[PDB]
């Protein structure tokens, strides 16, 4: 029904080295959908994504990603707006 969201880094995170932060989103009827990556709750500027979509059942598979250098204390999250959602869903990165 509503989108599935996973948030995870390309590697076991270590601080001061370069890794990638991924947001995988999947569901149905995506033409409208808006996905942001967040650092300390504010949008990350340069972010890329790859989209895969099928008309038969209107399924979609999106992957938003950014090269980032994690630290001890910087918090990172994914935000997703969709029609099915009355209010945007947030998923916090964990480790």
């Amino acid at each position, epitope marked *: 029904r509503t989108p599935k969201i996973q948030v995870y880094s390309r590697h076991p995170a270590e601080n001061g080295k370069s890794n990638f932060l991924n947001c995988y989103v999947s569901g149905f009827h995506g033409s409208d959908i808006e996905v942001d990556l967040l650092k*300390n709750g*504010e949008r990350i500027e340069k972010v890329e994504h790859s989209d895969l979509s099928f008309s038969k059942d209107w399924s979609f598979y999106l992957l938003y990603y950014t090269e980032f250098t994690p630290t001890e204390k910087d918090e990172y999250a994914c935000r997703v707006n969709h029609v099915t959602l009355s209010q*945007p869903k947030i998923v916090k990165w964990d480790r």
Partner: nanobody
Amino acid sequence: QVQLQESGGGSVQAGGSLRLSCAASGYTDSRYCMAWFRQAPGKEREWVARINSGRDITYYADSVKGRFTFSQDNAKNTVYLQMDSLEPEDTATYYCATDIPLRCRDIVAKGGDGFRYWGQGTQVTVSS
């Protein structure tokens, strides 16, 4: 330029509730992130809470998690921090801090204090 509106402090019986309030005029597009610190007698400064400029992400100090919650007014101009289940240890002066999203992004969420624009502070006294 940026003017803080910060309020709500006073005296409360322990176990009671108290709503702090913050807003700021002067920001471009009224877009600004916001955090609360408090200073109590006998302790260092303590970070309490943080909300982002879009107002849909909140981080809280473990010390207040489950007790303190951000909300917004109907008009959306002001942000509230609802403090329930107050204990005497929460007696302190509370301050809010604001800055533009571009800077806020690099101000660490739990603890970061690099905000340019602060309130003078509102005092909360929790008696037994």
